[PDB]
Structure formats: structure tokens, C-alpha cells
Design a protein around this ligand. Structure first.
Ligand SMILES: *[C@@H]1O[C@H](CO)[C@@H](O)[C@H](O[C@@H]2O[C@H](CO)[C@@H](O)[C@H](O)[C@H]2NC(C)=O)[C@H]1NC(C)=O
Ligand SMILES: *[C@@H]1O[C@H](CO)[C@@H](O)[C@H](O[C@@H]2O[C@H](CO)[C@@H](O)[C@H](O)[C@H]2NC(C)=O)[C@H]1NC(C)=O
Ligand SMILES: *[C@@H]1O[C@H](CO)[C@@H](O)[C@H](O[C@@H]2O[C@H](CO)[C@@H](O)[C@H](O)[C@H]2NC(C)=O)[C@H]1NC(C)=O
Ligand SMILES: *[C@H]1O[C@H](CO)[C@@H](O[C@@H]2O[C@H](CO)[C@@H](O)[C@H](O)[C@H]2NC(C)=O)[C@H](O)[C@H]1NC(C)=O
Ligand SMILES: *[C@H]1O[C@H](CO)[C@@H](O[C@@H]2O[C@H](CO)[C@@H](O)[C@H](O)[C@H]2NC(C)=O)[C@H](O)[C@H]1NC(C)=O
Ligand SMILES: *[C@H]1O[C@H](CO)[C@@H](O[C@@H]2O[C@H](CO)[C@@H](O)[C@H](O)[C@H]2NC(C)=O)[C@H](O)[C@H]1NC(C)=O
Ligand SMILES: *[C@@H]1O[C@H](CO)[C@@H](O)[C@H](O)[C@H]1NC(C)=O
Ligand SMILES: *[C@@H]1O[C@H](CO)[C@@H](O)[C@H](O)[C@H]1NC(C)=O
Ligand SMILES: *[C@@H]1O[C@H](CO)[C@@H](O)[C@H](O)[C@H]1NC(C)=O
Lengths: 162, 321, 321, 162, 321, 162
């Protein structure tokens, strides 16, 4: 993916994280677990929802065929009519298929970008107080209990404290 | 101790296409193309279609005696006609500007048939002998019920000078016809006079038909031909007819009571005892999808038609194996 | 000590839409849809339109006596006609292939009217008694000024055999007509002969009209009808007329001097004493925008018409609150 | 935004930087101030200008309606005509609205990308001679006077010197 | 010691356009627009076109004596006609519903001409004197070879009553005509009877033509006119003709043996002794590209036509200077 | 470019790397050389190949003109016909030109993204065992013979070893 996170430096997803699209997994002496990042998830939900409603709505006005009959010596205009109606269908079929292709690609990259941004947001907090393992994880130099972990998820990781 | 950033995965097998990659498995997806229908012709929001069955629009409107079912039909949502209805013009001929009239019915939901020239009204001509074996009814020779094939009386067809005034509020559709016989012998045998005409006038119409004699192939056992014409008589206008012979005179004409959104749908399907918001020639649609691929010719509140076999939007992200 | 990387912000409240987000505030934006017009009909690059006012194209070209304003009109950029002009055919009738002729005017900027058959030229028929109360002028009965309704002279309408040779360089539009009277009594009262015709020939035309007698609704107090025809006479070609009676003969015909880009615009608006590069039926456009949403039917150097209510491109970046 | 800089790790824009789209703010014992990065700004101006002229120009050839009249018994072709003209308007309206939507989204992301790239270009100069604060700023380990600051804006920051 | 990440560069000068940047040099690119053709008209997959050369479709089908080359032509892939063929109607006139017939040929690959009414068969009329100097052949007066201009015999043109039954399996195209003479003197000089007609009937056709007399401009030295008509006679149907005079009778008619994909292509080019899968009016196309910009009217397995001057996709990356 | 690698922090391409789109250049006491990264190259080839076949194929169904003739008093429908056929050409010409423009832009950015991702994949292995020079290169703190170099290209660089 364009942003390199999903199926990139983060090898795969988490069956175990059920309550959001992106989040954290922690590991300390007290235990381990998955916690969803609510802000980035909701952002992703709003964007994709608006994309779908945008797509549905732009396609709202679109060609409607109408039954039109012609006699045995009006073949030319019968054919003009058939061509005209078919032509618009082909145009609108193309618009629908291409839009879906193009936006699907952007939706996948959008998710990738959200993961990368959440990873960086964490990286930029921890700075040199943690080893960047290269797989999505940061190994702390200090011990980091559930309150410590929560502060990293907060946006609050007190760097001068550790 | 560590903290990791990650993303959702699940057991989804839904797939979406992109420009660069086909069949990508995603955690969540949204189909937007309706592919199914109920295979039936249904009422459109409670309003039943006019199903002409084995009759054509011409057979219906002229009153082909095989089309009695459609004498005084109630309001309709749309009309359904077969590709080749067997009960069209029972006595062979042409229907003039037939396609333009059909187009006119795409904007009509209801006719109210009325008698403009009574059959008893013809005191100088024979009004009950204009029947053919090509238009049978219950074993006997009959004819288009809405027009009267007038013939001579005691070897005299005197000139006809009739008028009807459209006094009612609603545009009136008026049908008449002319008979084209096989030869000079048949002309005198039916209408006496050798050279005849039918003149027709309104505020806008200036017509004068003359019968056209020729030997033709038999169709339904008849080598003669009937040519049918029509006009729309506006309110407060009058139509005048003048004829020597060969005149197929109106008896009943159609009052255009309700105008609106209709369509002549072409289909072999019969009534399916159902209701729907969206009807197509192959069946009715019941969906919330923005698109469908059933048929381009729809009526009602419908999704938008595309030729696609598949339209699926990614909502979620790339699902892990 | 520090150095920071950052980006511009300002007091802009301009907004743009995206697929995923509506109404995003940006520092800079560029509207590309022209939404305004001046509400007037104007000269197109100094060349004034032909504004037919209360006349139709037919009233104009035939010379309906209420349409004198448009006798010998100068070159025009485009034509403007009302939706239902009151001064059309003052004596009721039809104009044959009227829409095809109108289409022909979409490619003409100038006519130069000339006299091809003088009114004094009719030494055997009465050329100054062909007038009706349906075409009044200054309280008196008149008629289409460009054609002459010829009638009998001392109870004789002898056969007419006239020719005009298109000697001039420019295609010539020629109008004539036929009169359809109410009855046999009126036929003899005007043209004497009971059975008549009008034959018309050019290198390409092979026509023979016959009057059509019928009782019709009165329109403008007239139950008779006038049916008007036309052709384009090429240079160095000749048109020949032959008639027993009922012939409405050309006097004046139109020389097609200038061909070019024109249009028949439909509008109730009158002249607005202005100039413009781009005209629409609702008003003139003066903009540099690539798009507008005023009206699809434009003439001149115009933006491209869309049905949009709003088209705004982001140029700058997401503006901070 | 896809690149995470604008309204991301850089919280908001600068009312105070008036002479460009992207640039720097410095802070030392001598004072503080905003300086625009001319190269990245001009690049942004060229791209967006070409995008607008590309959009205007692709839409140049497009359907033009023409007045066409029909009589009372030419309803079918009158209707064909109306359908045909309306159909092209709907197609061209859709093309215009979708293009604007799609490219607006790309324009915003383009700016985001330019900011991120300018931030990285600075980061890659300073290496470990400055603390990455996580908000767009770098705090120097050494003192960094106006000449020092200018060298960072130059592309010239002499890393082995400090 | 170091390791660097980098990307390919090469000596390519290929360029591609983007929204934001024109003329970007890339390492690899793929043209998708075919811009060349061979400038010739060729066989379409081994099947040679019908090249009408200086004849029109009418000259061909009626059998204009300058169009003998196209007597009994073999199967064709497509037809080629010049913009203004000189050998059209040698005797001036009109061809009725000519454009609808041409449209019919867009779906026909082969005719097989057959004799339905022998020329010797006309025992009561003169069948070999219907010739004009306007249709010369080898210095002598001739006529459309497929129809017979019948004239009187010993000052009598007795009524004609002929029938042809379409016994063969294949739809039959039948041509006939009517002669419109200059005056009453010429009517009696050719057909004796002053007032004549031609009646034509099939299961569907109910026609009755009457000659139309008028003085016309000379075209090819003739002021008379010939008006040609046609129908498609279905299998097992019959056509009946009745006439007093002026009847241009069928001799040969066309058997529609093969229906299929054809086109009437308009071009001044002659045969180029070649074969191709894709033909255009300006030349043949031999390419694998998805698009071309030669001409919109193509026949065969062709790329898709666009108005572009250039379509080049980037495959590689931005090439370094 | 959006991802900042191609003609960005990596100044230009390598005439000397002939066997792939992206790869590595090494320098140690034993010598120097170019080696293509096969995985990222093949990925790039698959994506671009599918893009071309997608483009060719979506354009497959598209308006075909047909010869249609009209007489001297059928001008209105002749004009309708000409307008209708021209209108579809303009629509399809626009679709082709815009698609090429839009996707060319994406193809260039795609390559940029692949380079950036390959650079990061290396960066995330080496961590603090190498100086990030800022130009695409990493200077090792330890000596790094051909076997060492190969392990960086492997995905195998043993960080706790060095
Ligand atoms: C019959 O049709 C005529 C015209 O063809 C129409 O005018 C009649 O309506 C009345 O005509 C009267 C003229 O004799 C007129 O004085 C009266 O206003 C008019 N009625 C209306 C409602 O317009 C028609 N016959 C009727 C209504 O009995
Ligand atoms: C009148 O129209 C006829 C044909 O309908 C036309 O030919 C005349 O022009 C002249 O005809 C002469 C034949 O008598 C011919 O010798 C002469 O070349 C021709 N003139 C031109 C310019 O072609 C028309 N009458 C005229 C020009 O007086
Ligand atoms: C000639 O055309 C007539 C009708 O116009 C057609 O019916 C003839 O075919 C035969 O007609 C017979 C009636 O007399 C009928 O008994 C026979 O079935 C029919 N033949 C076929 C194959 O349908 C035509 N003449 C022929 C075939 O000689
Ligand atoms: C996020 O989490 C940190 C750690 O859990 C919060 O700080 C603690 O907050 C609790 C409840 O308010 C107090 O009882 C503790 O004394 C705090 N301890 C430490 C070590 O910080 C912080 O309030 C939270 N911040 C958010 C949600 O923004
Ligand atoms: C960018 O700025 C640095 C520092 O301002 C420049 O180096 C100085 O240049 C000035 C004027 O040329 C000299 O007087 C100084 O002696 C230099 N001092 C230092 C500490 O570098 C450098 O010339 C500039 N480089 C650019 C614009 O590329
Ligand atoms: C990638 O390369 C490293 C170093 O070249 C490989 O490890 C060596 O593999 C060879 C051959 O299998 C052995 O003879 C050596 O003993 C190994 N030495 C070292 C220092 O690692 C490794 O096998 C390769 N891994 C891949 C291709 O995944
Ligand atoms: C994608 O999946 C469909 C149906 O599951 C299959 O028919 C098709 O061949 C696959 N396409 C590709 C390109 O692998
Ligand atoms: C966006 O702004 C417009 C006008 O300012 C408003 O009418 C509209 O409701 C807003 N749309 C959304 C989706 O918030
Ligand atoms: C791009 O190159 C072409 C031909 O090589 C040239 O004609 C054109 O002017 C150039 N366009 C721009 C925008 O520089």
C-alpha cells in the first residue's frame, strides 16, 4: 500500500481487536491487550460514509430509457434511438465501474494512511525513550505499567518523566 | 514491555476490485448493485397496470370484438403489450400515425369512453350490416365495436353531413376509418356510388380521404383494407364528417380524463397479483441499492440502471489472511 | 533555540467540497461557475438580433399585415421569437414543412426581399380583391403582403402559366399558397371553375396541389384554409406555376444573401439596448469562467453550460480555525 | 490528511507567515520570526496552476445544445431530442462535479505532502544534533544564531560542524 | 561502508502528461493510440467490398446503363459510394424512400438478381421502345436495365393486370416506377389514355400512383420525370400491378440471399488490392492499440475511435536528467 | 513527488542499476555495486500491468458511429444525428484523456511510494547501527562485508549481532 503500514512494516491485522479499525496492543508485567483508538476510527468511519453517500448521490441524476416505437419505414430513426439509448448506458456503466475502481483504491490507501499516522503519532511521543522494533511495536527502556500505557494512548506520555 | 500499533482483521471473504489489483479481500464492503427481481408484473403503488393480454393497443382502442375485456377499462399505472399480439386489426389494414398515438398514451392514465354518434342515429343508411367473418364474435360475423361500417340502404348511399361538438371539458380522442374495397363491382355493391370520399375537418384538421381500389393478397380472408385515422378534438371544438361512401363512422370516442406518467411496456408476462414501487418488463424491484442491472426500461421510483455484473465498494481495509 | 516547519493560514472562509468531506475551509479557492447574467437581450458583437416581437416567423415571411415592422429587415445575429406569437397566420391554415424552414433560418443572417412577379403583371385576373377581415390593416381588410390571392375577372379564371428564372447569384426562397374554400358555391364564386389545381415545378420540384373542400370550424371568422408552401430556387434555375384557380401567387421572394451562424431563440424578453459576446434566452453573459448555469441554449463565445449550483476548486490548503 | 502534517502532527497554520504557503519559524536569543520556503511554495503554485488550466481545458470541448422544433405529430423525435440533449447535460454536469470533488481532495493532500516533505528535508539535515519535539519543531542541542538558522533553511546545515 | 536505496534511470526521452505537470520524462511508457493507416480500401477478412465507383446505389439497383459493371455483383463485405456519383438517375427524377432503402443495405451482404416479369411477356404493349438519349449506351438511347418503360401499341394502351408470387425462400426487393410527362400531348403520344394510374398491392402495400403533369426545368435534356418506388416482397406473398399507362414495370428484382453486417462507406478512394481486419473511409488499420484517431466510421474489428492527438500511459518512473 | 523519495531526498536515479526498478548500492572495502530488489520491482510490474489492462478494458465498450443518410427536407434529424454522434465522441475523448492524465500521475506517485517504502524497510532494520546520511544512504558504524550487505538486502540484518 502507498503508505507502507498495512501489510507492510506491520505484517498483518489483529483478529483480537474487535472494537475499532485501528488501535494498540500492550504487553507488560500486568498482562496484555487490545485497545481501539476511537478518534482515528471515527475519522475513518466519517470519511468512508461520506464517500459512499457522495458516490450514491452523484449517480442520482443519470440517463433513463423510455419506450419509443417506430414503423417499418422509420428504420433510420429507430436505429438512431437505439444507438442513443445504448450510448448513454455505456457511458453511465463506465462512470459507475471506474468510480468504484478508483475510489476502492483510495479507500484502501486511506486506511493505510490512518495506520501510518497513528504509528507516527506514537513514535513522536516516545522519541528516544523506546526502541523502534520495525514491526509496529515499541519496546520501552523503562517499565511501563497500565497507567503508563494509557498515557501513550492518551497523547499524554510524559517524556521528561521517563 | 511494549506497545504496538495495529489494525483490525476479521473472517470476511468479501472482495473488491481496484485499478491495480483485482479480488482484494477486505474486512468490510458494501454492494451497491441490485441484481434480483420478483419475476412478476405488479401494481405500481396500488394502481394496477392495463394488461392488454392478447390484444394490441389498436385492437383495444378500435374495439376488436376479441378485446371485450378492455371495453371501459379503469385507470392504469402503466400498459403492458405483447411483442406480437394476435388480436390486432381483425379486418386487415393500417392504423394511421399509430406510433405517434402510442406515444400519446405514454402520457395518459385514464380514458372514459363515450358515445358521440349513436348507431340508431343513422336513419338513411344501413348501420347494422357492416360485419365480416374476419372479425368473429361467438361464431358470428362482427366488427370493431367503436366504429360503424355504414352501407347503402335500398340502393342509395346519400351524402352524410354530421357534426360532433366537444362540449365536455376533457380532450377527446376520435377514431374513424375508410374502407378500400377490391374492385368497382364491390364499390357499387356496398356504397352504390363509384367515386367517393370522406372529408374531415376541425379547427386544425383539413382531411379528404378517397378510397383506393386494388387487388391485394388475402389477409384473414380479406383482400379489402380498412385504414384508420384519429385526431384529438379539443374542448369546445367540433369535428365535421362528409362522405359519399366507404366511411367507417365513429360511434364511441375516448375522453382523456387523466393525464400523467405512464408507459407502454413490452412483455409476455401476465399479472402477478403483487404491488411494487419499481417495475421492469421482466419483474418488479424491491431494493435500497443505488443501482440495478435488470432492465433499462423501468417505471416508478427505481435504482439507476447499469450494464454491470458487479459493483462493490470497499468500506473496510485489506483483510489479512 | 528551535526551528519549526509550518504552513500558511489566513482569515479566509471560502469552502470547497471533497468526496470524503463537505464544506472544508481553505486559505484560497477559485470559483469556476458563472451564475449571473444581465437579464437582457443584446446585440451579439455589435450585430443586433431580429426581434420578431408579436410576430411569428411565418407572419414575418409571408408578410402578415400586422408585421410591417419586419418588411425588409437588416442583417441579424440571431432571431428571437415568443413562445406563442399572436400574429401568425391571420387567415387560418397551415405552413408546410414549417419546422424544416425554421431550421434553414438557423443558418441565415440576412435576407434581401425582391419582387419576382409584379402585382400589375396579372392582366387576366383580379389581383387586388384577395383580402379578408381576418387580416386587417388600419381598419380595412388586407392579406399577406408577399403573396397575391388571385380571383376571377368578369366570371372567368383562365389558366395561369408563369415562370420565374433565378438569374441572381444567391439562392432564392420562394413562397406560394393554395386556398381551400368551404364549399362548391364558394369555389365558383371566387375562381369560377369547379375542379382546380396548382402545379409547381423546378429542376427538383414536382408538385400538383388540389384544393380540398370541407366544412371547418371558424378560426378568426374563417372556415376556409390557406396552405402555404415553399422551396429554395437555386441560381440559374426556374420555377413554373400552372393553375385553374385557388392559387396564392408569389409577389415577393427572399434572396439569401448571407449564410452563417444564427439561431431562433425562444424568449418573451424584448430588446435591452446592450452588447455582449454571449447571449442566452434569459439574458447575456459577461464572464471569464469556464462554466455557467444560466441556460443550455446559448449563442456566441460562451462558457460551457452545466446544471451545477456550485463549482469551486481548492487552490490553497486547509485553513486553520 | 493523507500525509499527516497539516492539521496532524503540525496542529495548525501560521497567520504570521504571509509570504508563502510553507516555511519556517525560528527562535533563538536574538529573536524569532517566519520565513517562507520559496522553492516548495513555487512548486506548489506551479502544480495547482497547471491543475486548474488542465481542468478548464479538458472541459473545453463539451456538448452544446441547439434549438430544434417539431410539430404536433412529431412527438416521438421531439422527445428523443429532449432526452438526447438532457442526457449529455447530465453527463457533463457529472464530469464537472466529480472532477472538482476528486481534484479538490488531491489538492489538499498535495499541500499536506509538501509540508511533510519540507519537514523531512529539515529532519534529515539535523539528524541527532536536535530534539524532534513532535509538533513540527526541532530544539537544537547547540546554540543556533540567525546564520545557523539560515543554513538550515539553505540546505546547508553543517552537521559535522555542530 | 554504506548501503543506499535508489531507483532506475535510463536514456529514455519518452514523456507523459499529468494533471499538474506536462511533458514529464519517464524511463518507460506505452503509447495506446494508433495514428497510422495504409491509405487504401481493402478486402475485409478476404471479402472484397462492393465499390460502386462512379455509380450511385440507385444507378446500381435500377440498372443505369453506365453501371453494367455492377450487374450481378458477388457477395460484399461493405459498400463504397462516392460523395456525388455522376451516374445516378440518368433520366431525371426521384427515388422514393431512398435513404430507408440505403439503410436496408447496411444489413445486406448479397443480392441475387432474378427475372420476375419477362420483357417478351408483354404481348399487348411495346416493351422495347422505352428509351431516352439521357440514358445512352454505346452511342444509342437506352434505359434503366431492370425496369421496362412500357408504351402503347397501335394506338392502344390496354389495362395491365399482372402478378408475381414470391415462391422462393428469400425476401425479394422489387422496384417499379411511374413516368411524369411534360404535358397532355405527351401523355397521349406515349400511353394514349389521358387519365392514368398505377395500382400496387401486397399483403401490406396499398398504393395507387397517378402521373403528375407539369412543365419542369430540363435536367439531362428531359423535363419529364421518373419516380421510382420499392417494396420488400416476403416469401409466399404476391405483388399485383394494375395500370392504364405511365407504368415502368419490373423486369428484374433482387433476391436477398445473405443478411449481415455491412455498411455504406462514403469515400473517393478506389480499390487498393489489400486485406485488413479494420477499414475506415480513409484507409485500413492494422494495430493492437486500444484506440485510434483515423475516422469514426469504421467496419471490422477495430480499436476505439477518439479525437485525441496523443495518448501515452506512464509505465516506468520519472527519468533523471 | 507525493512520497518525497524520487527526485526528492534521493536526488536522482541510477543509470548503473539495469535489472530492476528499485534496489540497492553498496560500498565496502571489497568493492561496490548495484543490486535490484526483486520483490518490490515485481510488485511494481504487477500493479502497472493490471492498471494498463484495466484501462484498456474499461474503454472496450464505447460509442461506435454508424453511417446514416437523410434527404434535403430531413435537416433537423440529420443535425440531431450529427450532434448525437459528435457528442458521444467528445464524451469518450474526454474520458480517455482524463483517465490517462489521472492515472499517469498515480503511476509516478506509485513508484515514489515504492522507493520510500523500500528505504524505510531498510531504515527500520538498521535502527541506530548506521548513520542516516539524508540522501538515500546509510553509513554503517561497524564494517559491513558482502555477507553483511546481503543480509540488509535479505530482510535479515542481525541488529543484536552488530
Ligand atoms: C360548439 O362548438 C362551437 C365552435 O365550434 C362553440 O363555440 C360552441 O360553444 C358556444 O358557441 C357560441 C356561439 O354560437 C358562443 O356564444 C358560446 O360562448 C360558446 N360556449 C362556450 C362555452 O364557449 C359549442 N357548443 C356549445 C357550447 O353548445
Ligand atoms: C434561365 O434558366 C435557364 C434554365 O432553367 C438557364 O439556362 C438560363 O441561363 C442561360 O441559358 C441559356 C440557354 O438558353 C444558356 O445558353 C446560357 O449559358 C445560360 N446562362 C448561364 C449563365 O448559365 C436562365 N436565363 C438567363 C441567364 O437569362
Ligand atoms: C402464391 O401466393 C399465395 C398467396 O398470395 C400462396 O398461398 C401460394 O402458396 C400456396 O397457396 C395455396 C392456396 O392456393 C396453399 O394451398 C399452399 O399451402 C400454399 N403454399 C405454401 C408453401 O404455403 C403461392 N403459390 C405457390 C406456392 O405456388
Ligand atoms: C490519561 O491517562 C493518564 C494515566 O492513566 C491520566 O493520569 C491519571 O489520571 C487519573 C484519573 O484522572 C489520576 O487518578 C492519576 O493520578 C493520573 N496518573 C498519572 C500517572 O497520570 C490522565 O488523566 C489521562 N489523560 C487524558 C484522558 O487526557
Ligand atoms: C546560506 O547561509 C549561510 C549562513 O548564512 C551562508 O554562509 C555564510 O555566507 C555569508 C555570505 O555569503 C558569508 O559572509 C559567511 O562567512 C558564511 N557564514 C557561514 C557560517 O556559513 C551560505 O553562503 C548560504 N548558502 C546558500 C544560500 O546556499
Ligand atoms: C541471506 O544472506 C545471509 C548472508 O549472506 C545468509 O546467511 C548466510 O548463508 C550462507 C548460505 O546459506 C551460509 O553459508 C552462511 O553461513 C550464512 N552467513 C551469515 C553471516 O548469515 C542467509 O542465509 C540469507 N537469508 C535469506 C536469503 O533469507
Ligand atoms: C476474481 O474472482 C472471480 C470470482 O470469484 C473470478 O471469476 C475471477 O477470475 C478472478 N479474477 C482474477 C483477475 O483473478
Ligand atoms: C455545507 O454548507 C452549505 C451552505 O453554507 C449548507 O447549506 C450545507 O447544509 C452544508 N453541508 C453539510 C454536509 O454540512
Ligand atoms: C510539451 O511538448 C510538446 C511537443 O514536444 C510541445 O509542443 C509543447 O509545447 C510542450 N508543452 C508544454 C506545456 O511545455
Amino acid at each position: 500500500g502507498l503508505f507502507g503500514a498495512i501489510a507492510g512494516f506491520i505484517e498483518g491485522g489483529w483478529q483480537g481487536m474487535v472494537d475499532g479499525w485501528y488501535g494498540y496492543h500492550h504487553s507488560n508485567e500486568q498482562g496484555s491487550g487490545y485497545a481501539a483508538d476511537k478518534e482515528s476510527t471515527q475519522k475513518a468511519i466519517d470519511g468512508v460514509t461520506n464517500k459512499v453517500n457522495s458516490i450514491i448521490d452523484k449517480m442520482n441524476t443519470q440517463f433513463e430509457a423510455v419506450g419509443r416505437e417506430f414503423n417499418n419505414l422509420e428504420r433510420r430513426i429507430e436505429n438512431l434511438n437505439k444507438k442513443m439509448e445504448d450510448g448513454f448506458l455505456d457511458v453511465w456503466t463506465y462512470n459507475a465501474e471506474l468510480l468504484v475502481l478508483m475510489e476502492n483504491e483510495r479507500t484502501l490507501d486511506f486506511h493505510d494512511s490512518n495506520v501510518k499516522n497513528l504509528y507516527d503519532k506514537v513514535r513522536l511521543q516516545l522519541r528516544d525513550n523506546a526502541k523502534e522494533l520495525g514491526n509496529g511495536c515499541f519496546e520501552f527502556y523503562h517499565k511501563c505499567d497500565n497507567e503508563c500505557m494509557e498515557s501513550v494512548r492518551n497523547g499524554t506520555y510524559d517524556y521528561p518523566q521517563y | 514491555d511494549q506497545i504496538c500499533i495495529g489494525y483490525h482483521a476479521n473472517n470476511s471473504t468479501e472482495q473488491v476490485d481496484t485499478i491495480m489489483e483485482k479480488n482484494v479481500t477486505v474486512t468490510h464492503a458494501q454492494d451497491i448493485l441490485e441484481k434480483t427481481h420478483n419475476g412478476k408484473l405488479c401494481d405500481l403503488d396500488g394502481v394496477k397496470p392495463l394488461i392488454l393480454r392478447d390484444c394490441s393497443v389498436a385492437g383495444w382502442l378500435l374495439g376488436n370484438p376479441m378485446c371485450d375485456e378492455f371495453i371501459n377499462v379503469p385507470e392504469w399505472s402503466y400498459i403492458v403489450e405483447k411483442a406480437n399480439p394476435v388480436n390486432d386489426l381483425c379486418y386487415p389494414g393500417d392504423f394511421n400515425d399509430y406510433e405517434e398515438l402510442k406515444h400519446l398514451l405514454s402520457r395518459i392514465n385514464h380514458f372514459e369512453k363515450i358515445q358521440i354518434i349513436p348507431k340508431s342515429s343513422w336513419s338513411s343508411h344501413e348501420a347494422s350490416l357492416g360485419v365480416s367473418s374476419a372479425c368473429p364474435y361467438q361464431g358470428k360475423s362482427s366488427f370493431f365495436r367503436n366504429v360503424v361500417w355504414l352501407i347503402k340502404k335500398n340502393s342509395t348511399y346519400p351524402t352524410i353531413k354530421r357534426s360532433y361538438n366537444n362540449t365536455n371539458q376533457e380532450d377527446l380522442l376520435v377514431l374513424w376509418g375508410i374502407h378500400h374495397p377490391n374492385d368497382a363491382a364491390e364499390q357499387t355493391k356496398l356504397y352504390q356510388n363509384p367515386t367517393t370520399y370522406i372529408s374531415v375537418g376541425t379547427s386544425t384538421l383539413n382531411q379528404r380521404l378517397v378510397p383506393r381500389i386494388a387487388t391485394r393478397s388475402k389477409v384473414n380472408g380479406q383482400s379489402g383494407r380498412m385504414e384508420f385515422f384519429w385526431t384529438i378534438l379539443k374542448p369546445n371544438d367540433a369535428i365535421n364528417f362528409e362522405s359519399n361512401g366507404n366511411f367507417i363512422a365513429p360511434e364511441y370516442a375516448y375522453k382523456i380524463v387523466k393525464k400523467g406518467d405512464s408507459t407502454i411496456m413490452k412483455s409476455e408476462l401476465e399479472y402477478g397479483n403483487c404491488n411494487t414501487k419499481c417495475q421492469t418488463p421482466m419483474g418488479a424491484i424491491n431494493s435500497s441499492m443505488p443501482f440495478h442491472n435488470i432492465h433499462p426500461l423501468t417505471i416508478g421510483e427505481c435504482p439507476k440502471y447499469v450494464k454491470s455484473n458487479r459493483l462493490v465498494l470497499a468500506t473496510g481495509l485489506r483483510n489479512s489472511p
